[PDB]
Design a protein around this ligand. Structure first.
Ligand code: CA
Ligand code: CA
Ligand code: CA
Ligand code: CA
Length: 391
């Protein structure tokens, strides 16, 4: 019956492979350091997403030699939670961060074990001031951080999720073939200055400056933050963002991702190659080049082997499900079906898409699908009915 799921997930998979969701790092020779750019998604409580576009620069505090890396990225897995015995406004954070993006230093020695962390933030967003203190520990062997933060000035005037990126990338796990690309540990113990501008789409921006360095045996991140131009009714000052992660995979969701994986993995060997990916995308009426295919795989290719293996696919789909897609992204998916751009998916346009995915399909399982999605009753699927089908 409902294989709006199978094809829904394949659309989600291709959308993910066509997007840039990681933390992209590049050398900045003029500053003897690095710069980064990335996009963060903050789910909006009532539906929708609030995008936050980050630009970042890091410069070493010391004069010692540092590693200036080839282009690569960090991939972050975050989980936010609450301490049931904590009365104060607070956030508990657990993060695993790994570098990738490149295919197959003295300061790094400071990170072979568990290192205590302290974080201190003083903030001012549209004149609303606040401070946060955090403490915990990092275990870079696994890319792992555990921290608890408290708003020490009372009530935090912005949502906790918007501060996560600001509140120690020296704890990232760099794989063995990428150790010469880890600028962050190479700058230790004297540390680095990290600066960002963060643009919240349709809203204001944060500007941050931080000093990250060892003070005795503790890695300390001391930050100032200034936010301007926020809407007093927007998602940030109006506190409309979801807090809790949404990290639960109902095992049959995993079975669903497996079914989607098999659309790509047509030889059944448990990994997707460029040839397989290209075969799927041509069937959907696209024509990416070999280089575009390699770049798409590289975006999720944790091990650098040039293919997406089943666990790498599960990891990418888990993250795609955790965060809401923007209207622009959903419209792009909708355009895949709405081939004539009239704003309506007809049973003919729908036939075409699935029948190209290899869905041996006839003529009433098709219409049973239209029926499922067809809420107003006009015999077609419009954008708003489509949005729901992608949920
Ligand atoms: Ca395969
Ligand atoms: Ca791989
Ligand atoms: Ca149409
Ligand atoms: Ca309709």
């Amino acid at each position: 019956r409902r294989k709006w799921n199978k094809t829904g997930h394949a659309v989600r998979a291709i959308g993910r492979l066509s997007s840039l969701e990681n933390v992209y790092i590049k050398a900045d020779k003029q500053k003897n350091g690095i710069k980064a750019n990335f996009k963060i998604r903050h789910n909006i409580e009532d539906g929708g997403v609030q995008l936050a576009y980050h630009y970042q620069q890091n410069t070493p505090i010391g004069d010692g030699p540092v590693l200036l890396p080839d282009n690569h990225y960090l991939s972050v897995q975050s989980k936010l939670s609450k301490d049931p015995n904590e009365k104060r406004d607070h956030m508990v954070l657990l993060e695993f961060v790994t570098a990738a993006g490149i295919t197959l230093s003295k300061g790094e020695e400071l990170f072979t074990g568990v290192v205590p962390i302290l974080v201190e933030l003083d903030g001012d967003v549209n004149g609303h001031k606040f401070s946060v203190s955090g403490e915990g520990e990092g275990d870079a062997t696994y890319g792992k951080l555990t921290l608890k933060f408290i708003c020490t000035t009372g009530k935090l005037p912005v949502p906790w999720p918007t501060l996560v990126t600001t509140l120690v990338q020296c704890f990232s796990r760099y794989p063995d073939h990428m150790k010469q690309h880890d600028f962050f540990k190479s700058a230790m113990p004297e540390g680095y200055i990290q600066e960002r501008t963060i643009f919240f789409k349709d809203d204001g921006n944060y500007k941050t400056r931080a000093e990250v360095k060892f003070e005795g045996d503790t890695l300390v991140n001391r930050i100032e933050l200034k936010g301007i131009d926020f809407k007093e009714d927007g998602n940030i000052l109006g506190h409309k963002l979801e807090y809790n992660t949404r990290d639960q995979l109902t095992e049959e969701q995993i079975a669903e991702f497996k079914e989607a994986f098999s659309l790509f993995d047509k030889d059944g060997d448990g990994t997707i190659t460029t040839k397989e990916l290209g075969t799927v995308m041509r069937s959907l009426g696209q024509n990416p080049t070999e280089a575009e295919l390699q770049d798409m795989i590289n975006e999720v290719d944790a091990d650098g082997d040039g293919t997406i293996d089943f666990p790498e696919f599960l990891t990418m789909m888990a993250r795609k499900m955790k965060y809401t897609d923007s209207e622009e992204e959903i419209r792009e998916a909708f355009r895949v079906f709405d081939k004539d751009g009239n704003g309506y998916i007809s049973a003919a346009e729908l036939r075409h898409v699935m029948t190209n995915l290899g869905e041996k399909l006839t003529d009433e399982e098709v219409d049973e699908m239209i029926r499922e999605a067809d809420i107003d009753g006009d015999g077609q699927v419009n954008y708003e009915e489509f949005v729901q089908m992608m949920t």
